[PDB]
Design a protein around this ligand. Structure first.
Ligand SMILES: Nc1nc2c(ncn2[C@@H]2O[C@H](COP(=O)(O)OP(=O)(O)OP(=O)(O)O)[C@@H](O)[C@H]2O)c(=O)[nH]1
Ligand SMILES: [Mg+2]
Ligand SMILES: [Mg+2]
Ligand SMILES: [Mg+2]
Lengths: 404, 250
DNA sequence: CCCACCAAAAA
RNA sequence: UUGGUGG
């Protein structure tokens, strides 16, 4: 993973908003250096005028040495596909979406755009006039990855084109595609609600809501009046999206815990781990400390939330070296992070830190067993899904463009 | 004094809850005495006011849309549509069979509509939001609804720590960017942007520093609350927000 | 396919 | 519900 200066992250953010957000890091900075002296005149043709202008004003305020409050943005490249690649250990899927590095023949690490890759792979094999527009293809890919069968059937028909679409997905992301396949057959026809707990203790409840349509006559003409009611359903297409979204939800909470931390709390936990803290104990801490430590054992996901429940008595139930290792992996200075589910904004002098923290979380998900842990609660019995490449997490730590 | 200003903002928000404020326009503020008239045509009082309100909102609405908002008043879907015919024939509003929609007749004044446009949505807090300790209350001093978005309440653990951590990020308005949009966007509606500034100025009356409140959906995605000021939502919205604690970059 | 949130129409 | 916003 290559690092950048605070001023360089300003450069990347302003380039993004012009925007060349699919370009490599250095091409973005190269484009910037060329246009530094004319930035205020480029506002009218930028893709995001307002954000571009805000960034430019920040860059100017930085040149004059003035303080700034402007946060740069680093976005997940296909959040969902990234999480599924990590859950399933799918090295081929990871290369689609920057979970691990992809190099061209030159050997340069490229900023990949999964939908384009799959769109190109599909033209290469379909050949001979393939009548399909790239954005209709992205819709089919992304709705399929969340379990839609209707929308890819709408973009590709139900014939040979659909067949080629499913074959391509099966070579470019076998385990991700199999897992999406699998989620469809995981609904419980008797269930009014699904429940699962995330490793940081968040309780997800999904109530099953089905259409009740009362029909009505008004001037001897017919009108259908449909209202959502709680019920059950034979299949359900919701589990892939909801499980995946609960996990990016988790990544947001945990990333903000590791970045925007209380410096005084960290030093207390460090002393507590080394036996140097004054005695402090609360019985109410025990249950939660046990619960969160347990999720760590079953999943590999140690939440910094556990810091809230560690005391003289409760530290005895955890492995203090794991706590200290986690703290040592956090940024050396804390910072605020604004999040839009899979977009992240921070002051540019923390750019390096936020990418390191995102990488660690993807790698944690890749290494461990979060998928089994969640699926077992969804379907109601112990299941175990294996990684397709159990070493993927080693490469995840070093990936270049997970956030871009 | 900022505490006082905060109580004022919450006072404005509580008086401009969309539907209760609209009802007032048809009850205690109408020259028309809808109580007497609804008795006359044999239409339940609360039902009729709500239909009037729904028509003042939608302006135009097809039949399934209008019955949806009112279904909870009757034991049958059919009873609702009949009542609506009864009100349309008594000129409470019109139904035009060639477009299959209802068209409003009686709409709220512009002065009340502007207050609703300004204050019906939650605003940032200008003091530190309340620390959350149960799954009720969303950071403000006068709300105690379920913190989870839509009808999805649980009292199980939903990681209040994250909301409390996000709620204390101090933010401010970058007035330089905010003025650029109004001055320069058209060469890069007008009614809408008019109310943004009034709210932003009122918001920052005691200083350019404030806090967004945060709520989780049922899955645990986190959503910052507010329409006019929000780092989530529109690109013209993101651009104006920055950290209140500025830093020298190096 | 899954969420969350706005906004309210023509002689 | 027609639409539009963010992901
Ligand atoms: N389930 C579902 N999720 C969506 C949809 N649109 C966006 N998302 C969410 O957004 C994530 C990917 O972000 P995109 O909307 O594709 O943004 P992008 O990949 O950067 O592409 P751009 O539009 O160019 O920004 C997915 O993992 C989803 O969680 C959708 O239509 N359905
Ligand atoms: Mg984007
Ligand atoms: Mg819609
Ligand atoms: Mg959209």
């Amino acid at each position: 993973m290559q690092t950048f200066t605070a001023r360089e992250y300003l450069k990347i953010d302003i380039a993004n908003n012009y925007g060349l957000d699919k370009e490599d890091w250095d091409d973005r900075i190269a484009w910037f250096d060329k246009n530094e002296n004319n930035l205020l005149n480029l506002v009218r043709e930028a893709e995001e005028p307002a954000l571009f202008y805000a960034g430019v004003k920040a860059w100017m305020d930085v040149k004059e040495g003035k303080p700034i409050g402007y946060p740069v943005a680093l976005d997940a490249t296909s959040s969902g596909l990234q999480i599924l690649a990590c859950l399933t250990g799918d090295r081929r899927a990871a290369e689609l979406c920057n979970v691990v590095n992809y190099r061209d023949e030159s050997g340069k690490v490229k900023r990949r755009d999964a939908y384009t890759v799959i769109y190109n792979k599909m033209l290469n094999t379909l050949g001979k006039g393939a009548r399909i527009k790239r954005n209709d293809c992205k819709q089919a890919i992304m709705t399929a990855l969340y379990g839609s069968e209707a929308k890819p059937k709408e973009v590709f028909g139900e014939g040979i084109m659909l067949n080629v679409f499913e074959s391509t997905m099966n070579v470019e992301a076998p385990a991700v595609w199999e897992l999406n396949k699998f989620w469809l057959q995981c609904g419980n026809p008797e269930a009014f609600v699904y429940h699962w707990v995330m490793p940081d203790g968040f309780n997800v409840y999904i109530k099953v809501m089905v259409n009740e349509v009362e029909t009505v006559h008004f001037l001897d003409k017919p009108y259908d009046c449909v209202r959502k009611v709680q019920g059950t359903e034979e299949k359900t297409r919701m589990l892939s999206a909801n499980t995946t979204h609960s996990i990016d939800g988790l990544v947001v909470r945990e990333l903000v815990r590791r970045c925007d931390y209380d410096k005084n709390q960290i030093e207390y936990i460090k002393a507590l781990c080394n036996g140097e803290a004054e005695y402090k104990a609360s019985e109410k801490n025990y249950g939660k400390a046990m619960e969160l430590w347990g999720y760590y054992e079953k999943t590999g996901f140690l939440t910094a939330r556990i810091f809230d429940y560690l005391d003289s008595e409760t530290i005895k139930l955890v492995n203090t070296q794991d706590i200290l290792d986690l703290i040592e992996s956090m940024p050396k200075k804390p910072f605020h992070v604004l999040t839009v589910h899979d977009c992240f904004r921070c002051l540019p002098n923390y750019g390096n830190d936020i990418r390191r923290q995102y990488n660690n979380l993807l790698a944690t998900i890749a290494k461990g067993d979060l998928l089994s842990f969640i699926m077992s609660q969804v379907i109601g019995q112990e299941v175990t899904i294996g990684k397709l490449d159990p070493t993927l997490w080693e490469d995840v730590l070093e990936t270049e463009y997970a956030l871009s | 004094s900022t505490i006082e200003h905060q109580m004022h903002l919450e006072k404005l928000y509580n008086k401009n809850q969309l539907l209760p404020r609209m009802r007032q326009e048809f009850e205690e503020n109408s020259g028309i005495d809808f109580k007497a008239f609804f008795a006359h045509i044999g239409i339940d009082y609360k039902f009729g006011i709500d239909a009037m309100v729904q028509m003042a909102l939608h302006k135009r609405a097809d039949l399934p849309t209008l019955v949806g908002t009112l279904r909870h008043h009757c034991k049958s879907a059919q009873e609702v549509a009949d009542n609506l015919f009864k009100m349309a024939s008594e000129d409470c509003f019109n139904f035009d069979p060639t477009i299959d929609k209802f068209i409003v007749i009686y709409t709220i004044s512009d002065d009340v509509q502007h207050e609703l446009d300004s204050f019906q949505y939650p605003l940032p807090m200008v003091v530190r939001p309340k620390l959350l300790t149960k799954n009720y209350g969303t950071g403000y001093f006068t709300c105690n609804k379920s913190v989870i978005l839509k009808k999805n309440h649980t009292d199980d653990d939903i990681c209040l720590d994250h909301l409390n951590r996000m709620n204390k990020i101090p933010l401010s308005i970058n007035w330089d960017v905010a003025h650029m949009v109004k001055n320069e966007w058209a060469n890069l509606f007008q009614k809408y942007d008019r109310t943004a500034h009034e709210v932003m100025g009122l918001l920052t009356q005691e200083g350019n520093k404030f806090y967004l409140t945060h709520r989780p959906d049922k899955r645990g995605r986190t959503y910052s609350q507010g329409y006019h000021v929000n780092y989530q939502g529109t690109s013209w919205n993101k651009a104006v927000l920055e950290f209140a604690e500025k830093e020298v970059i190096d």
